[PDB]
Design a protein around this ligand. Structure first.
Ligand code: CLA
Ligand code: CLA
Ligand code: CLA
Ligand code: CLA
Ligand code: CLA
Ligand code: CLA
Ligand code: CLA
Ligand code: CLA
Ligand SMILES: CCCCCCCCCCCCCCCC(=O)OC[C@H](COP(=O)(O)OC[C@@H](O)CO)OC(=O)CCCCCCCCCCCCCCC
Ligand SMILES: CC1=C(/C=C/C(C)=C\C=C\C(C)=C\C=C\C=C(C)\C=C/C=C(C)/C=C/C2=C(C)CCCC2(C)C)C(C)(C)CCC1
Ligand SMILES: CC(C)[C@H](C)/C=C/[C@H](C)[C@H]1CC[C@@H]2C3=CC=C4C[C@@H](O)CC[C@]4(C)[C@@H]3CC[C@@]21C
Lengths: 179, 136, 38, 743, 54, 174
């Protein structure tokens, strides 16, 4: 049966979105692009993907080494005590200072440009190593889709990391090794 | 449907409502000392005064400053008589300026003078009668 | 979509300028309290 | 039969900032450039007047649905702010531990210019400004025990505000309903009666039964707030609810078997105030909400909507017709479906009356726990709702006049109640004016007479208990009937609805909660003063609404508009002849009436209800029985109330209440500044502005926007605004300082 | 079984009054009449119970 | 006229789902047929799952949850805290994402067959249109027998003092 147009859901009428890098799923069951700008949502999703990938790898990497010059009295990286102590010692305060500097001085102009229809969402032109190749061609759209999928997985895994640590009071590696 | 123009002619600044105009209302408004047919101005004034002073004495005797003394009734009667004199003065002034010389039909100087005299006499007599009733 | 022009209107510019002036005055008053006779 | 269907227009208005850079775009005249300073004022004066912008009812309806959403979002933001202040900067937990000893406070002033003194020693560790909004009592009645719940509620409020923001924008730029929508008054009424109010009260009753009842029962049993089980535990573990209320053992079976009497543990009708906290029994409140929910739900199925069953408001209106009213209520349905001003007038009058009733019922029957013992909160809430109610009533009159001047139609209003009233408006206003004169004489004259007697040493000739007595026999009789109602007319009621009618007194924390409010000669005179002032203010508003279209002085006031300065210095003078000016005068009279009403409540409460109780039952009020013989004279009202009670607001300097004292002075200034705009005219200010403009011209510093004086109508508006602001602020600071310093 | 009997009688009375007032026999009239009958039966049963009859 | 003699033609005879026209109350005349059909197929699927779960849990329990009542009421009360709570969370999530909008669109004019999702992994729907129609009619026919069955099972358990379906079928009947 179904309607005239289809969606990967196989029971939905295709929305405005068509075939975007990593957007072949057209996963918009609840109307979010019909009222909000697509560029705004895409920029937000890519920003979330990047910050979440760094967070997932950071949580796993922090459980092995703490540099030895940071107190780190708590071995739980996603615990409020560790967040508060690192904020008090100034480490997270400095991360906040520079991350806010980037967002206001560069992030805001970047989002305004992408909202006007000039800059592709989440495109900062950062390709030190020619890994993605030419923009808008082979090795780029596929790599962009890979980035989106890895970021979504990292976002879901960060939520899992936080909830598991807060419920078991055990680290990710510690919990993986025991129960 | 009961509310109609007073004279059945619209554009008039009045309405013929139930208590405004009715069989009972028209009968009651009529026949009073005033508006009654075949009554001389002096008779109308006498009736009005004897009916006014009677109830005018009440307030002064009951709530006058000397209501607790043994002369409460006398003091109230005197106060009522004074108020009656002032009212008669007002009536006479109104007749002196509002009306002119013409036939005595209650709308002339002589007619209103007779009405004022009757009102004064009636009011004094009514106040005296009420005082007598209170004393007895 | 000329947001800059709206932000440049009299009420917006006036509120921003007065907010900055009040902030400067308050900040000076907590860093240098009870200032009198210069 | 009409289909109650939803039809909307998509992308009717584009979302862009282009119109933000063009002030006055909504008006044809304001979009041509200012050319003078009067344009700045006109821009704000006609900003929310959607009826003046366009002549289409559909556009106005959409501009109202939206902006209603915006105001709802603003209210949700304010509520979120109150909850966040309670969670972050308030001593709510400490207050819960010791509700009688700790003073509520949720504001912390920053230390910058010596203002840190305002942080009163309210107790509970933190020091701040004592709040008299009753937020603490309300939260306690709702079952809040920890600040985490307050934080979650604040976050939920912020989310609801965001939703009300999105809804407002979506219903104006993405899906705007057509005029057919908004004209379905039957459906709107059915939903608001069964869904907004019926289901709302039902849900609140459920929350009280599952959260408020058990938590408050444990709190009143000496259990610490931290040791009380969480609200969700009472729902998951039914054993706890059964232990606290055996009725839960039977479950919902009794409800479905009509054995409602088995719910006597949770659905009680005790009738009185709780002797532990001084407020109404939460069980009686839950049962009350359940009954009001069931009654509203049943009432919500009266009108006909998309089905054969129901009623038609138009048919009911046209059916009501009598000999004294030719066409009865014919044409009123079309009036309330084609003019938002008429609906706004009716709704504003009812909402204001509801607020006034709320104030009376809230002070007499304290609903929240520990609310009666917190006299500052009681005074502030009664006075606050009294003022908001009066303002909404004056607004109701103003909008009635607006509809009469702009949306009135002779064909629609033909031989109906409205037309028949406009026909005899002279009888209405002259008879009402006569009533006002009689009331003023027999109300204020009694006070003046008492002043004259007391000054002459003739106390035996006064209108007091010792001298001539004027006892409210009717009101006293109703009080006695209420006192005896719990046993002869309320068989299932275990106590009188309010202890203010009689019964016995209630004391909580060595403080009087509610005791019989005996009425005497002073109350007789003050109540008549209240009636006199209400009559004069309603006379002013009714006169302005009845003559809004025309009068014997100005035969075409409607063509001149609803808000116009005057017709000129002709016919002897036609100043303040428009209906808007009648609203302007009604504002002062409403302020006078409301000020006297709040004055009576404050003094009577502090002299016969609020006070302390010493062991063995001895009662000592703040002002021991002085209202009985001091409220019967203007001198007493100035000496024992305005002078004696002001000592707290004038001596507040050097303490945490100093702010109030400052506000007490500032308000005065404002109230005195209003006189400037009320006893002056714009001709003089225009000439002064001419001289100042010449001075500017002499220095080549003149502005392009020609400086102009405030319009005549704008001047009147500014004067009344400043007058009301100053007066209400002065009485606000006086009330708050007096009630906080003592009691 | 007094309560079920009274409720059934109330439902029938509601059905009759509904058919008369609305003047039609349909699902809408049926449900409306049942609602009225229930609002009348619940009240009659609770009133009689409060009086001790049932 | 319809399968039921006393009621009049109940309409909904030219649509799809069942040759028999059993709608005596004509509820479809006052409600969207697609919405009602969507609710019907959902009820059938939920009831069939519950019937199999009832006949399975009462016969064998997983190593986890070793000690837990088997009765529907007892099992619900004992698992309403952690197991059923999680089941409700995920089922509600599925309804919130794919459930509510599906019915909304179907009612708003979408041509979606009520109860249609792309969940046909083994391709058992059939190739021929007649086979597909018979298969849908079978799914709904098998349903409405599981709804009544679940109601009957619950009533029997309540009136049997918490007795299993097979246990009650082997011990007593009343
Ligand atoms: C909109 C307002 C509102 C809301 C949202 C709720 C919501 C809720 N109420 Mg509630 N309630 C309300 C108002 C509200 N109530 C009002 C106005 C009253 C009357 C004052 C009640 C009185 C009430 C009681 C007494 C109970 C609830 C309970 C509940 C919870 C479960 C209800 C349930 O399905 O159990 C269903 C319970 C039944 C007994 C079903 C009846 C038919 C069964 C199937 C009988 C067949 C026999 C079978 C073997 C079961 C034996 C049960 C027996 C031992 C009791 C639920 C969260 C229950 C709860 O969870 O307590 C915390 C509870 O016991 N409510
Ligand atoms: C911050 C999270 C976030 C955001 C902003 C987006 C935004 C976007 N996604 Mg994406 N997605 C996400 C997370 C997110 N996604 C995750 C974790 C998996 C996916 C998988 C996915 C696929 C496969 C696709 C998208 C696509 C898109 C784009 C169009 C659809 C849309 O508007 O959805 C908007 C979504 C949001 C605005 C997020 C808010 C949703 C709710 C309110 C948040 C709460 C969710 C909560 C955690 C769920 C709990 C479940 C629990 C009850 C069991 C859009 C730019 C489509 C695309 O075209 O890519 C370019 C597409 O094909 N997403
Ligand atoms: C307007 C309020 C008011 C009222 C109700 C009173 C009332 C009173 N004053 Mg007072 N007074 C007032 C204002 C008032 N005063 C003010 C403002 C001052 C200061 C200037 C004074 C100064 C003053 C003094 C110095 C004294 C009083 C005194 C008195 C008492 C006797 C006065 C008297 O004899 O009058 C006479 C009254 C009348 C002649 C007639 C009254 C009108 C009638 C009853 C109305 C009937 C209408 C009727 C129902 C219509 C329908 C009827 C129709 C259909 C048939 C009395 C109880 C005296 C006293 O000793 O106090 C006890 C006294 O010495 N007063
Ligand atoms: C508008 C005029 C104004 C000016 C000229 C200043 C100037 C200054 N502020 Mg200040 N501030 C202001 C307004 C202002 N502030 C307002 C409106 C607030 C909120 C009430 C604050 C709150 C604030 C805090 C908490 C602190 C300062 C501090 C300082 C000094 C730090 C050095 C610096 O150069 O930073 C320049 C700073 C600015 C030009 C103002 C930026 C304010 C941003 C928004 C940060 C505040 C974040 C706030 C806590 C949370 C969100 C606020 C929201 C508006 C986004 C400084 C000279 C720091 C200090 O005390 O020095 C030892 C410090 O701790 N300010
Ligand atoms: C049972 C259904 C229902 C409910 C609960 C409401 C509730 C409300 N309506 Mg509404 N209305 C309804 C049906 C309903 N309406 C229908 C069918 C019509 C067409 C005939 C209207 C037409 C209508 C108009 C024209 C207006 C309202 C307004 C309002 C608000 C009044 C302001 C207030 O008292 O603050 C109380 C606020 C709250 C208690 C917060 C609750 C808010 C939540 C979201 C409940 C509302 C649900 C909503 C009606 C439907 C959800 C739609 C869905 C697609 C998301 C209030 C929230 C006025 C308004 O404020 O405009 C926004 C107004 O102008 N209604
Ligand atoms: C739900 C309540 C409600 C609503 C929806 C409306 C809606 C409306 N009113 Mg109405 N009104 C109301 C209540 C309401 N009113 C009340 C309670 C009163 C009595 C005070 C009035 C008296 C009134 C009058 C006399 C008039 C209106 C007018 C109007 C229309 C245009 C408003 C406008 O554009 O002016 C713009 C609004 C402003 C410029 C804001 C003025 C600010 C004042 C002084 C309030 C200050 C409050 C604040 C607490 C002060 C302290 C803070 C300070 C230190 C900064 C509009 C449709 C006008 C109209 O119909 O057009 C011809 C009209 O003349 N209203
Ligand atoms: C409290 C009562 C009051 C006050 C304060 C004033 C004040 C003033 N009158 Mg005046 N007047 C009054 C009553 C009052 N009048 C009455 C009852 C009448 C009889 C109708 C008059 C008739 C009258 C006339 C005919 C004239 C004046 C003039 C003036 C001004 C004289 C010049 C001056 O001193 O400027 C100094 C300014 C002040 C004293 C005001 C204080 C400064 C304010 C508070 C600061 C700004 C606001 C501040 C930021 C706070 C608000 C913030 C906002 C967010 C709410 C002055 C502003 C004359 C004039 O125009 O002068 C050129 C003029 O000719 N008045
Ligand atoms: C025909 C059989 C029958 C019998 C024998 C009873 C018997 C009884 N009913 Mg009952 N009732 C019945 C049918 C019956 N009812 C039906 C069919 C309905 C549905 C319409 C109701 C609905 C009903 C209600 C709602 C109530 C009763 C109540 C009662 C009991 C006391 C009533 C009384 O006499 O006090 C006499 C009371 C007065 C003389 C005071 C009159 C009401 C005051 C003045 C309030 C006025 C309200 C306001 C002005 C109007 C409504 C405004 C609107 C906004 C709501 C009593 C034992 C009461 C109860 O709950 O028992 C405890 C009660 O509240 N019944
Ligand atoms: C006389 C018994 C009532 C006691 C008095 C207090 C009643 C409260 C209701 C207020 C209106 C007065 C009732 C008569 C009014 C009344 O109900 O009359 C009856 C009549 C209504 O009957 P109809 O045949 O018109 O009915 C058809 C329509 O009502 C359709 O619903 O109303 C009028 O047409 C005249 C309206 C006011 C007439 C002018 C009177 C104004 C005086 C106001 C002061 C009242 C006394 C103050 C208290 C002492
Ligand atoms: C409002 C009201 C009313 C009223 C009534 C009335 C008021 C009645 C009556 C009455 C009156 C008010 C009366 C009076 C009187 C008087 C008299 C009866 C007398 C007499 C006689 C004599 C003895 C005389 C003498 C003389 C002399 C001595 C000389 C000179 C001359 C003369 C002749 C004067 C009613 C109930 C209706 C209704 C309700 C209320
Ligand atoms: C905020 C989310 C949670 C909700 C579900 C959003 C729903 C949006 C507004 C969309 C989704 C489907 C509806 C949708 C269907 C089709 C569109 C086309 C597009 O011109 C926008 C409107 C419009 C006509 C509407 C707007 C209203 C809906 C309901």
């Amino acid at each position: 049966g179904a309607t005239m147009p289809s969606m990967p859901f196989l029971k939905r009428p295709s929305k405005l979105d068509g075939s975007l890098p990593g957007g072949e799923g057209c996963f918009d069951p609840l109307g979010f692009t019909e009222v909000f700008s697509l560029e705004w949502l895409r920029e937000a999703e890519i920003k979330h993907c990047r910050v979440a990938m760094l967070a997932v790898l950071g949580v796993i990497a922090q459980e092995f080494g703490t540099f030895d010059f940071y107190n780190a009295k708590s071995k739980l990286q996603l615990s409020p005590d560790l967040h508060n102590q690192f904020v008090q010692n100034g480490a997270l305060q400095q991360i906040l200072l520079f991350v806010c500097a980037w967002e206001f001085i560069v992030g805001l102009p970047a989002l305004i440009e992408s909202v006007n229809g000039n800059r592709e969402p989440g495109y900062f032109g950062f390709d030190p190593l020619k890994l993605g190749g030419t923009v808008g061609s082979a090795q780029w759209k596929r790599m962009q889709a890979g980035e989106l999928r890895n970021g979504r997985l990292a976002m879901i895994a960060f939520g899992g990391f936080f909830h598991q640590q807060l419920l078991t009071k055990q680290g990710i590696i510690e919990q993986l090794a025991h129960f | 449907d009961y509310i109609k123009p007073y004279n059945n002619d619209p554009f008039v600044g009045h309405l013929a409502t139930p208590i405004n105009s009715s069989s009972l209302t028209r009968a009651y408004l009529s026949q009073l000392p005033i508006y009654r047919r075949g009554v001389s101005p002096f008779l109308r004034g006498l009736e009005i005064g004897m009916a006014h002073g009677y109830f005018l004495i009440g307030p002064f005797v009951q709530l006058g400053p000397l209501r607790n003394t043994d002369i409460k009734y006398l003091a109230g009667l005197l106060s009522a008589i004074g108020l009656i004199v002032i009212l008669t003065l007002g009536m006479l002034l109104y007749g002196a300026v509002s009306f002119t010389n013409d036939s005595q039909d209650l709308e002339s100087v002589d007619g209103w003078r007779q009405l004022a005299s009757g009102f004064l006499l009636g009011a004094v007599g009514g106040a005296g009668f009420a005082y007598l009733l209170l004393t007895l | 979509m000329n947001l800059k022009k709206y932000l440049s209107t009299a009420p917006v510019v006036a509120t921003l300028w007065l907010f900055l002036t009040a902030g400067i005055l308050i900040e000076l008053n907590r860093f240098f309290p009870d200032s009198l006779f210069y | 039969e009409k289909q109650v269907k939803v039809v909307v227009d998509r992308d009717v208005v584009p979302t862009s900032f282009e119109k933000w850079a063009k002030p006055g775009h909504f008006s044809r005249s304001l979009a041509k450039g200012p050319k003078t300073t009067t344009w700045i004022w006109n821009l704000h004066a006609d900003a929310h007047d959607f009826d003046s912008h366009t002549s289409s009812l559909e556009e106005v309806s959409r501009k109202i649905f939206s902006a209603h959403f915006g105001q709802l979002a603003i209210i949700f933001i304010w509520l979120s702010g109150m909850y966040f202040h309670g969670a972050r900067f308030s001593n709510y937990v400490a207050w819960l531990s010791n509700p009688t000893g700790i003073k509520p406070s949720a504001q912390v002033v920053w230390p910058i210019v010596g203002q840190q003194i305002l942080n009163a020693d309210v107790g509970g560790g933190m020091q701040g400004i004592q709040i008299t909004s009753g937020l603490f009592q309300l939260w306690r009645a709702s079952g809040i025990v920890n600040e985490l719940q307050l934080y979650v509620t604040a976050l939920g409020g912020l989310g609801m505000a965001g939703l009300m923001i999105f809804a407002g924008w979506f219903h104006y730029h993405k899906a705007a309903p057509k005029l057919e929508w908004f004209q379905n008054v039957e459906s709107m009424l059915n939903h608001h009666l069964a869904g907004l109010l019926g289901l709302g009260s039902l849900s609140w009753a459920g929350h009280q039964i599952h959260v408020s009842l058990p938590i408050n029962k444990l709190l009143d049993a000496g259990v610490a707030p931290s040791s009380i089980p969480l609200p969700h535990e009472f729902i998951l573990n039914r054993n706890l609810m059964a232990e606290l209320y055996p009725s839960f053992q039977q479950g919902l079976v009794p409800f479905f078997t009509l054995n409602w009497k088995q719910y006597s543990d949770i659905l009680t009708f005790k009738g009185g105030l709780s002797p532990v906290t001084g407020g109404l029994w939460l069980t009686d409140v839950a049962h009350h909400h359940l009954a009001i929910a069931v009654l509203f739900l049943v009432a919500g199925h009266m009108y006909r909507t998309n089905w054969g069953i129901g009623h038609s408001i138009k048919q009911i209106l046209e059916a009501h017709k009598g000999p004294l009213t030719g066409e009865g209520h014919k044409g009123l349905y079309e009036i309330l479906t084609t003019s938002w001003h008429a609906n706004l007038a009716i709704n504003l009058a009812m909402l204001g009356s509801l607020s006034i009733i709320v104030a009376h019922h809230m002070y007499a029957m304290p609903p929240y726990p520990y609310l009666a013992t917190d006299y500052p909160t009681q005074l502030s809430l009664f006075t606050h709702h009294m003022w908001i109610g009066g303002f909404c009533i004056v607004g109701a009159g103003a909008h009635a006049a607006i509809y009469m001047v702009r949306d009135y139609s002779p064909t629609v209003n033909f031989n109906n109640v409205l037309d028949r009233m406009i026909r005899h408006r002279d009888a209405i206003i002259s008879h009402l004016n006569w009533v006002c004169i009689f009331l003023g004489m027999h109300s204020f004259g009694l006070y003046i007479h008492n002043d004259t007697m007391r000054a002459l040493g003739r106390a035996q000739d006064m209108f007091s208990d010792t001298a001539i007595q004027l006892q409210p026999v009717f009101a006293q009789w109703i009080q006695q009937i209420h006192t005896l109602a719990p046993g002869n007319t309320a068989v299932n009621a275990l106590a009188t609805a309010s202890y203010a009618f009689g019964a016995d007194t209630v004391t909580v924390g060595s403080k009087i909660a509610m005791m019989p409010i005996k009425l005497g000669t002073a109350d007789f005179m003050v109540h008549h003063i209240h009636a006199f002032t209400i009559h004069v203010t309603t006379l002013i508003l009714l006169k302005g609404v009845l003559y809004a279209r025309n009068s014997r002085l100005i035969p075409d006031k409607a063509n001149l508009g609803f808000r116009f300065p005057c017709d000129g210095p002709g016919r002897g003078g036609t100043c303040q002849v428009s209906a808007w000016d009648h609203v302007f005068l009604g504002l002062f009279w409403m302020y006078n009436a409301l000020s006297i009403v709040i004055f009576h409540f404050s003094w009577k409460m502090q002299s016969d209800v609020w006070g302390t109780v010493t062991s063995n039952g001895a009662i000592s009020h703040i002002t021991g029985g002085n209202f009985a013989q001091s409220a019967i004279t203007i001198n007493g009202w100035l000496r024992d109330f305005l002078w004696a009670q002001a000592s707290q607001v004038i001596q507040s300097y050097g303490s945490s209440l100093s702010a109030y004292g400052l506000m007490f002075l500032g308000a005065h200034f404002v109230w005195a500044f209003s006189l400037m705009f009320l006893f002056s005219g714009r001709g003089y200010w225009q000439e002064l502005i001419e001289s100042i403009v010449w001075a500017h011209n002499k220095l080549k510093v003149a502005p392009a926007i020609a400086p102009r004086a405030l319009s005549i109508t704008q001047g009147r508006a500014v004067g009344v605004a400043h007058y009301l602001l100053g007066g209400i602020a002065t009485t606000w600071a006086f009330f708050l300082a007096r009630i906080i310093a003592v009691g | 079984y007094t309560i079920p009997t009274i409720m059934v009688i109330s439902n029938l009375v509601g059905v009759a009054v509904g058919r008369y007032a609305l003047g039609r026999s349909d699902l809408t009239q049926l449900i409306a009449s049942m609602c009225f009958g229930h609002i009348i039966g619940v009240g009659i049963v609770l009133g009689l119970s409060n009086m001790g009859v049932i | 006229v319809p399968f039921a003699p006393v009621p009049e033609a109940v309409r909904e005879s030219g649509l799809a789902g069942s040759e028999a026209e059993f709608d005596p109350l004509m509820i479809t005349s006052y409600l969207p047929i697609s919405w009602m059909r969507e609710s019907e197929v959902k009820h059938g699927r939920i009831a069939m799952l519950a019937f199999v779960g009832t006949l399975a849990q009462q016969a064998y329990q997983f190593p986890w949850y070793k000690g837990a009542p088997t009765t529907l009421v007892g099992a619900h009360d004992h698992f309403v805290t952690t197991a059923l709570a999680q089941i409700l969370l995920f089922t509600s999530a599925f309804e919130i994402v794919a459930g509510v909008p599906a019915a909304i669109q179907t009612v708003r004019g979408s041509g979606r067959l009520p109860g249609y999702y792309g969940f046909d992994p083994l391709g058992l729907w059939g190739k021929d249109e007649a086979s597909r129609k018979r298969m849908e009619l079978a799914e709904v026919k098998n349903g409405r027998l599981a709804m009544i069955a679940m109601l009957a099972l619950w009533h029997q358990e309540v009136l049997s003092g918490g007795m299993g379906v097979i246990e009650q079928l082997v011990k007593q009947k009343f």
